[PDB]
Amino acid sequence: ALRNQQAMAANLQARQIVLQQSYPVIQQVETQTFDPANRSVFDVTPANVGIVKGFLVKVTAAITNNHATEAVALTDFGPANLVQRVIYYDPDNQRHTETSGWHLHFVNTAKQGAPFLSSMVTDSPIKYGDVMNVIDAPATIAAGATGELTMYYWVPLAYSETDLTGAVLANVPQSKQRLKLEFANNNTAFAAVGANPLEAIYQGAGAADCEFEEISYTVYQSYLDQLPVGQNGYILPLIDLSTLYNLENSAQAGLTPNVDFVVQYANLYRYLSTIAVFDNGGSFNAGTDINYLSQRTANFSDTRKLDPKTWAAQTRRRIATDFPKGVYYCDNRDKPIYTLQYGNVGFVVNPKTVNQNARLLMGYEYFTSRT
Amino acid sequence: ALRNQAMAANLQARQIVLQQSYPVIQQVETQTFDPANRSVFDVTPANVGIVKGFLVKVTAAITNNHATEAVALTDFGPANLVQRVIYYDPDNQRHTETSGWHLHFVNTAKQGAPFLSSMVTDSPIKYGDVMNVIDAPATIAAGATGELTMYYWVPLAYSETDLTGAVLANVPQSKQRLKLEFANNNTAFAAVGANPLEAIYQGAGAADCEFEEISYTVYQSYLDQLPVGQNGYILPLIDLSTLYNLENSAQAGLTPNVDFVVQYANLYRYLSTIAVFDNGGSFNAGTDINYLSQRTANFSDTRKLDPKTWAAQTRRRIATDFKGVYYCDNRDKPIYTLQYGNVGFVVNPKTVNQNARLLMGYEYFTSRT
Amino acid sequence: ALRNQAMAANLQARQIVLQQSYPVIQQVETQTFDPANRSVFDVTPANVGIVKGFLVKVTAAITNNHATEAVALTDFGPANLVQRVIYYDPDNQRHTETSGWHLHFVNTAKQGAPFLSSMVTDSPIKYGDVMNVIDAPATIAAGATGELTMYYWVPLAYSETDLTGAVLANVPQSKQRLKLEFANNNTAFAAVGANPLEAIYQGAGAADCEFEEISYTVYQSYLDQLPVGQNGYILPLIDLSTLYNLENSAQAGLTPNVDFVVQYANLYRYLSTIAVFDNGGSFNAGTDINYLSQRTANFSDTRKLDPKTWAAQTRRRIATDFPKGVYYCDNRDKPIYTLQYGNVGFVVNPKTVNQNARLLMGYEYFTSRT
Amino acid sequence: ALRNQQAMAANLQARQIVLQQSYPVIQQVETQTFDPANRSVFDVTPANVGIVKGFLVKVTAAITNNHATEAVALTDFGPANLVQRVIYYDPDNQRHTETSGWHLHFVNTAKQGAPFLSSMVTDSPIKYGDVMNVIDAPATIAAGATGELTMYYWVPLAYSETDLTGAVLANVPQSKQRLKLEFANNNTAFAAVGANPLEAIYQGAGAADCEFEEISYTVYQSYLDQLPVGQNGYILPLIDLSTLYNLENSAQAGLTPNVDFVVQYANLYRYLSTIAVFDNGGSFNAGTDINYLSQRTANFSDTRKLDPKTWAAQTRRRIATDFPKGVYYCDNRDKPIYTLQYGNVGFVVNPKTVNQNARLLMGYEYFTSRT
Structure with missing residues (x-):
């Protein structure tokens, strides 16, 4: 209990x-x-x-x-x-x-x-x-x-x-x-x-x-x-020391114009931040190749479906400037994305233009239990 | 005081x-x-x-x-x-x-x-x-x-x-x-x-x-x-019964070297004040002002400052300046008179052109009453 | 009658x-x-x-x-x-x-x-x-x-x-x-x-x-x-469950010297009636009308009047005349309320009828949301 | 009680x-x-x-x-x-x-x-x-x-x-x-x-x-x-006879283009009507020098913020015509303006044009207690 x-x-x-x-x-x-x-x-x-x-x-x-x-x-x-x-x-x-x-x-x-x-x-x-x-x-x-x-x-x-x-x-x-x-x-x-x-x-x-x-x-x-x-040796924060705080990245492909490209969060991890890089076939654009980005939960319910400039506005509040062309950031530090807390969640990008060999390079920051 | x-x-x-x-x-x-x-x-x-x-x-x-x-x-x-x-x-x-x-x-x-x-x-x-x-x-x-x-x-x-x-x-x-x-x-x-x-x-x-x-x-x-x-929705009743508003106003009647005072109303807890010196269409970088201040009747000024020093306080708040726009932060201790005009915002102008006026902007809290 | x-x-x-x-x-x-x-x-x-x-x-x-x-x-x-x-x-x-x-x-x-x-x-x-x-x-x-x-x-x-x-x-x-x-x-x-x-x-x-x-x-x-x-908002339930509407309609089939009757519907309490005699695009100051009236079946007319006398009643209501061919009727104190469709009608007996003549009707009425 | x-x-x-x-x-x-x-x-x-x-x-x-x-x-x-x-x-x-x-x-x-x-x-x-x-x-x-x-x-x-x-x-x-x-x-x-x-x-x-x-x-x-x-001498309406029904006027200056000029109601009085004359430096215009007029209470909440012609429309319903150029009227007879009943109230004029020596001449009709 x-x-x-x-x-x-x-x-x-x-x-x-x-x-x-x-x-x-x-x-x-x-x-x-x-x-x-x-x-x-x-x-x-x-x-x-x-x-x-x-x-x-x-x-x-x-x-x-x-x-x-x-x-x-x-x-x-x-x-x-x-x-x-x-x-x-x-x-x-x-x-x-x-x-x-x-x-x-x-x-x-x-x-x-x-x-x-x-x-x-x-x-x-x-x-x-x-x-x-x-x-x-x-x-x-x-x-x-x-x-x-x-x-x-x-x-x-x-x-x-x-x-x-x-x-x-x-x-x-x-x-x-x-x-x-x-x-x-x-x-x-x-x-x-x-x-x-x-x-x-x-x-x-x-x-x-x-x-x-x-x-x-x-x-x-x-x-x-x-x-x-x-009185028991070293005074140590046992939860702190048995938790892993990691960064990892991966590449996802399969984007097509005007269709929601959804990258599911790989459950159990507590995702603190997400970075999505739209490598549009070697081209990196300042939002012009995207209709919107979002984080969506099992219910097709979007918590922040935003046009690229408005998405960028949220990031400007976090780092006082914009990340380089084609790089999008999402802060979930205070309320980490954690499936099992509210169904499957996904990071979404609906592209306006998709060149050959287009892909999303995903970067995650997360906490997970050791062992 | 069941307020606590x-x-x-x-x-x-x-x-x-x-x-x-x-x-x-x-x-x-x-x-x-x-x-x-x-x-x-x-x-x-x-x-x-x-x-x-x-x-x-x-x-x-x-x-x-x-x-x-x-x-x-x-x-x-x-x-x-x-x-x-x-x-x-x-x-x-x-x-x-x-x-x-x-x-x-x-x-x-x-x-x-x-x-x-x-x-x-x-x-x-x-x-x-x-x-x-x-x-x-x-x-x-x-x-x-x-x-x-x-x-x-x-x-x-x-x-x-x-x-x-x-x-x-x-x-x-x-x-x-x-x-x-x-x-x-x-x-x-x-x-x-x-x-x-x-x-x-x-x-x-x-x-x-x-x-x-x-x-x-x-x-x-x-x-x-x-x-x-138990009773239902857990809600911050004070938060939801309080209004956080921004409002503007315009004041005229400025005269060279004379204190121009814009009184604050009572009841409102003023978090910030912005005063724009529209000097007849001209906007100057403090050169048309002797000083600005906030004053309480029978207790003088709490911050009578030359324009550059006033601007210095603002630089600590927004990392730059903010021509003719002046800001005042009272967030930690909001201006709250209790009596209309116990406190006023002051501008003593150095030069006053035709059609001069101060455009005021306020941030305040007040109960829905 | 818990209506009172x-x-x-x-x-x-x-x-x-x-x-x-x-x-x-x-x-x-x-x-x-x-x-x-x-x-x-x-x-x-x-x-x-x-x-x-x-x-x-x-x-x-x-x-x-x-x-x-x-x-x-x-x-x-x-x-x-x-x-x-x-x-x-x-x-x-x-x-x-x-x-x-x-x-x-x-x-x-x-x-x-x-x-x-x-x-x-x-x-x-x-x-x-x-x-x-x-x-x-x-x-x-x-x-x-x-x-x-x-x-x-x-x-x-x-x-x-x-x-x-x-x-x-x-x-x-x-x-x-x-x-x-x-x-x-x-x-x-x-x-x-x-x-x-x-x-x-x-x-x-x-x-x-x-x-x-x-x-x-x-x-x-x-x-x-x-x-x-006590129970909450103090509200006039009858006021808020009643509709006060204005509506218009068009009627044709006028013939010289014959009573042209536009029936009022039942259920509605008609406060006013406006009838515009669009005489084939011509709008006359009563000269193309013999008389106007409001009539109840089997009880004749309650106000069969020549056009000028009809206009006189309107002058008492708006201190002037409405434009040519526009006729007004005030029934505010005692609204037309039939209970049976057409028990009451608005009448116009035309003196002259041009091609494409018609009466454009306008009504003010009260009716329950039911 | x-x-x-x-x-x-x-x-x-x-x-x-x-x-x-x-x-x-x-x-x-x-x-x-x-x-x-x-x-x-x-x-x-x-x-x-x-x-x-x-x-x-x-x-x-x-x-x-x-x-x-x-x-x-x-x-x-x-x-x-x-x-x-x-x-x-x-x-x-x-x-x-x-x-x-x-x-x-x-x-x-x-x-x-x-x-x-x-x-x-x-x-x-x-x-x-x-x-x-x-x-x-x-x-x-x-x-x-x-x-x-x-x-x-x-x-x-x-x-x-x-x-x-x-x-x-x-x-x-x-x-x-x-x-x-x-x-x-x-x-x-x-x-x-x-x-x-x-x-x-x-x-x-x-x-x-x-x-x-x-x-x-x-x-x-x-x-x-x-x-x-x-049985007590003259039968007299004591409240009527100890109440003052007065008219008074004053002049207010300090108008600047596109800024709300607010004339606060001098509390305690029950204001039945307000007349505002825009003496624009000797010029009296038919609303063309005004963006809008209004009555506003402590809350920046306007009860009748109207463009000049619409404001004039309300007056035409009261006197069957318009007051002379630059003269604006406001009827508050049935619900007199009375601060202490709903915070400070003000009469507002937002001028479109302001000539030299411009001012608002305010005329009030009000009830107040004697003594």
């Missing part, structure tokens, strides 16, 4: 005590510089200490355009595509997040409430601004030039700094975690004119002759040390 | 409603028309659950048919696509009755930044003004047609978490009335030298500008699946 | 409502359009309190594009800016369904003078036709554009003090329907020699006249803040 | 008895002929007899235009401006009405339901018509001509012939009433071209050379004699 109500209360209290008694630490775990032509997949081994909240991954790169005459220009995702995929496994080898660099980056932005680690432009005469180039990439790389890029990703375990749901307790020696990073290479980073720019960093007539010179990464692990001890 | 009990209960009921019901935003009406034929519409909301507000989307195409002269956006621009709004609840009681520009400025004050705007940053990832949510061409050249988009949020409930002012509409069949008066060919275009206050574009080609058409879509935001208990 | 009790209660409730509620007149809709594209509109009233009626303001600009010929107002003139009106209440029941000119004539009969007119007096103080409330140019010359203004009151309640026929609309969400059909380029202009009955202007330049545009604004009059008692 | 309900009933009964038992009388109180160049203010002393209902004031005048060539023409108010102001004080020196001749005249018209004491034009062949020139003034007075004018004003104490609310009991010897009449003179009666015609009788290029030759007035007092006596 009220056995869980007491469980919930115990969890929250334990969380509050851990946060107040422990001290946060962020420390470098590993750094490596390489040429992706040699190797692009790396398995980083996080340190086993206290409760792990997440990882901040710094990625830098140098790209050279050796085309004789043509330039290349940033794609809509640009440096967010420096990391193609990220996968994390905890000490019990349970997989948490497994998604694309672009999806992880869009969630980082959604959680910040503004473009992740960006520098806002103001009229201040004091010289604040893009001083440190935290996330940066040249808009174009001309024939014969070399550009430098910097990108950051936050790989979460814990939901936030104050909500430890999804965090990982790593104090078991001989049982390691694994943070796998799959980086871009010359094949994924450069798209020829007319090719699909989805996974690319630069696109243009000089693409065939573009090459990475090097990529470097530094992984910083954020955790809580000096865990509080009481 | 009433408030304690009200707040608990509000939380149960927010926790148990499910939010819905739904289109209730769309229409396209030519301002030459009509510009006043009465939208009928759906009578379902607890209504929180209405999101009104307005799009328009404006053609500058002048032979050689262009026009440029006024300071309010697309915010003048809707001239006025009035809302009547199922009990025939009015809530908001104000201008489109005042409604828009409150939307901005409540968001803490220009309403539904896209902030500019150094991000290399292509975030930005991708969807043109609120948009209008800076100028429309002779012979050109410009496309505009504007959004307004007409609030009933104070916010997503504070249901004060919300309307229970699952109640009687009696209809709600959301009245909208749109800009027309007579209000949208101002000739050079004319007052641009209510206009969208001003310039030498104004006389030959016209609307090709205007379209609006109203979305209703409400809470459905209301929680039921 | 019902009526006694109804009347008391009416008085409480009038005493306790507050009257409101509010704009519900405005629209400007070109008759070439559309002329029929369905206005949706607000569902609030007890609705008494609608004030409809209509303005129009008419351009005579003819090269050299003018046109002049017909006898009905701006009263034909609205061709027809129909009102449906929240329960899908129709009340008034009649022509704009009949509605206007009833508005006049109820006011006791030409509706919303400005009376002329010797006052040196400048009262007069200052605001042009109902107005239209007597003629529109070739190449000219005239501006017109017309007002109509569509009643639900019988009057400001008698709520019989009023509609309770705070009730269900079900919508009311106020349907309006406006004049268009095909009905507003009559060529010389053509029937001017439904037209606004007639003349040699008619074929080249057209509307520049028409605009309307509907104002809804209702009572808000309805009084509540 | 029901102490007032019994008071109301007692009052009405007393009123009914007074009306049925007493006999109405109207008798001349004073007549005087003068040149306003000599004196224009007169304090008339009404006779102290019975219950006084009001005064009918007959005013005649002769005006000469001695300009060498130019004429003058009647202003919109014309002879209604022969009396500039009227003020009445009762035997206790309590002031009742204090207003302008034009406002008093407009109320006389509103109460009659037609232009006050006018002669209606009809097709009657019998010679009814303007036979007696009760209220009359030549439309123009040519250079070198003399015109004759006649004007009548009813100064009310009692509300009507059947409602004695506001009447005055004057049976106290040694305590007199005062009816002060302030007449027009050469300065107020003639306006030059381009000057404000508000208070003037004639305006035109010959104005500077116009002069009154004389003005004459005759005041008739209307009262009830032979007051009924019962």
Whole structure:
């Protein structure tokens, strides 16, 4: 009965005590510089200490355009595509997040409430601004030039700094975690004119002759040390630590003009957010190829059937700007989509135009029970 | 004072409603028309659950048919696509009755930044003004047609978490009335030298500008699946018996270097005040004002400030400025006189042109009594 | 007869409502359009309190594009800016369904003078036709554009003090329907020699006249803040369950010197009757009629009168004469109520009958929703 | 509790008895002929007899235009401006009405339901018509001509012939009433071209050379004699006689285009009617300088927000014609505006055009308690 109500209360209290008694630490775990032509997949081994909240991954790169005459220009995702995929496994080898660099980056932005680690432009005469180039990439790389890029990703375990749901307790020696990073290479980073720019960093007539010179990464692990001890050992939020907070993405196809394309939510998960990217056969449009988007439950009842601009309006309230062309976001944080609470639910897109090889790339943020 | 009990209960009921019901935003009406034929519409909301507000989307195409002269956006621009709004609840009681520009400025004050705007940053990832949510061409050249988009949020409930002012509409069949008066060919275009206050574009080609058409879509935001208990629906009775309204007014009689005082009425709890100094058609960036203030009779000013310092307080609220438009936040401690005029809004003008006046805008709470 | 009790209660409730509620007149809709594209509109009233009626303001600009010929107002003139009106209440029941000119004539009969007119007096103080409330140019010359203004009151309640026929609309969400059909380029202009009955202007330049545009604004009059008692809303149940409607009809088959009888139906309590003698497009000042009357089968006529004497009774009601060929009959104090269909008829014995002659009838009546 | 309900009933009964038992009388109180160049203010002393209902004031005048060539023409108010102001004080020196001749005249018209004491034009062949020139003034007075004018004003104490609310009991010897009449003179009666015609009788290029030759007035007092006596002396409607029925006017400025100009009702009074004159800097327009007019209560809720022609339509139902240009009327007789019954109320005018020196001249008709 009220056995869980007491469980919930115990969890929250334990969380509050851990946060107040422990001290946060962020420390470098590993750094490596390489040429992706040699190797692009790396398995980083996080340190086993206290409760792990997440990882901040710094990625830098140098790209050279050796085309004789043509330039290349940033794609809509640009440096967010420096990391193609990220996968994390905890000490019990349970997989948490497994998604694309672009999806992880869009969630980082959604959680910040503004473009992740960006520098806002103001009229201040004091010289604040893009001083440190935290996330940066040249808009174009001309024939014969070399550009430098910097990108950051936050790989979460814990939901936030104050909500430890999804965090990982790593104090078991001989049982390691694994943070796998799959980086871009010359094949994924450069798209020829007319090719699909989805996974690319630069696109243009000089693409065939573009090459990475090097990529470097530094992984910083954020955790809580000096865990509080009481009468039974460590005071720990048991629900928090046995819940997985994950990001995952998938691709759905089968769109036809003026027909509702419905992507069912894969039940049992508590979906906090949904990102839908309309890759219209390599074309990414600013809503003009969509009639409306919606979230619908078993009853054909729509809770937010909106035209594209109005849908975008809701997103502007969340991140203070629009996501790139063809990228749509839906916040369900306060009331996560959870089938079994109200029948099957689906994310809906009714397309106005559908090109060949059209598809919806879905990105989800969700909570689910461990084991 | 059984009030503590009433408030304690009200707040608990509000939380149960927010926790148990499910939010819905739904289109209730769309229409396209030519301002030459009509510009006043009465939208009928759906009578379902607890209504929180209405999101009104307005799009328009404006053609500058002048032979050689262009026009440029006024300071309010697309915010003048809707001239006025009035809302009547199922009990025939009015809530908001104000201008489109005042409604828009409150939307901005409540968001803490220009309403539904896209902030500019150094991000290399292509975030930005991708969807043109609120948009209008800076100028429309002779012979050109410009496309505009504007959004307004007409609030009933104070916010997503504070249901004060919300309307229970699952109640009687009696209809709600959301009245909208749109800009027309007579209000949208101002000739050079004319007052641009209510206009969208001003310039030498104004006389030959016209609307090709205007379209609006109203979305209703409400809470459905209301929680039921012993006695029935669990409802925040104080929230639902309180009105959260925006209203505007105009005052004249300004004289150089003399305090011009606009009295606040009693009974109303004023959350914010906006004062626009329409200096005879000229809108200046504080240079025509000595100071502004809020004053209580026999207790002097609580914030007599020069225009720039007054603007500084506003920058803390909306991250920018908001020419001639002044804002005052009294949300944490609402102006509440108890005696008519115990408190007034003050403007001591430096220069006063012919036909000068202050256009006031208010946000307030008041009991249905 | 528990009726006395019902009526006694109804009347008391009416008085409480009038005493306790507050009257409101509010704009519900405005629209400007070109008759070439559309002329029929369905206005949706607000569902609030007890609705008494609608004030409809209509303005129009008419351009005579003819090269050299003018046109002049017909006898009905701006009263034909609205061709027809129909009102449906929240329960899908129709009340008034009649022509704009009949509605206007009833508005006049109820006011006791030409509706919303400005009376002329010797006052040196400048009262007069200052605001042009109902107005239209007597003629529109070739190449000219005239501006017109017309007002109509569509009643639900019988009057400001008698709520019989009023509609309770705070009730269900079900919508009311106020349907309006406006004049268009095909009905507003009559060529010389053509029937001017439904037209606004007639003349040699008619074929080249057209509307520049028409605009309307509907104002809804209702009572808000309805009084509540023990059982709840204090309401006049008889008033609200009775329909007060205006309706029109057309009858033909007239023959010189023969009584032409238009039977009244049973069930309806007829408050007034209007009969227009459209004598094949000609409208005469009584010279084509021998007499008019109201007759009950097997009890003869209750008012068989020559046209001038019939007109004299009307002068006592509206302080002037209705236009040529338009005849009015007031039965407000003792409504025509047959109980048997046709026990009573309206009579016109014509002196001269032209081709295509007919009587256009207009009625004001009360009837239970049953 | 029901102490007032019994008071109301007692009052009405007393009123009914007074009306049925007493006999109405109207008798001349004073007549005087003068040149306003000599004196224009007169304090008339009404006779102290019975219950006084009001005064009918007959005013005649002769005006000469001695300009060498130019004429003058009647202003919109014309002879209604022969009396500039009227003020009445009762035997206790309590002031009742204090207003302008034009406002008093407009109320006389509103109460009659037609232009006050006018002669209606009809097709009657019998010679009814303007036979007696009760209220009359030549439309123009040519250079070198003399015109004759006649004007009548009813100064009310009692509300009507059947409602004695506001009447005055004057049976106290040694305590007199005062009816002060302030007449027009050469300065107020003639306006030059381009000057404000508000208070003037004639305006035109010959104005500077116009002069009154004389003005004459005759005041008739209307009262009830032979007051009924019962068991306690005079049977008198105590509420009626202790209530003031007054007319007053004021000027409000501060109008700006497209902004609601609100004139708050000065609470506690029961306002029966409101007249608003839009003196647009000396220009008086037929509604074209106004967007709408309204009466609004604390709630921004309008009970009759109407465009000018529709507002005029309501007035045509009341006086069978329109008031002069720029004059707007509002009837609240059956449900008087009374703050404290429904929050503050205001009369509203939203102007379309506002000239220099624009203002609203407000005229009120109201009931208020004595003492």
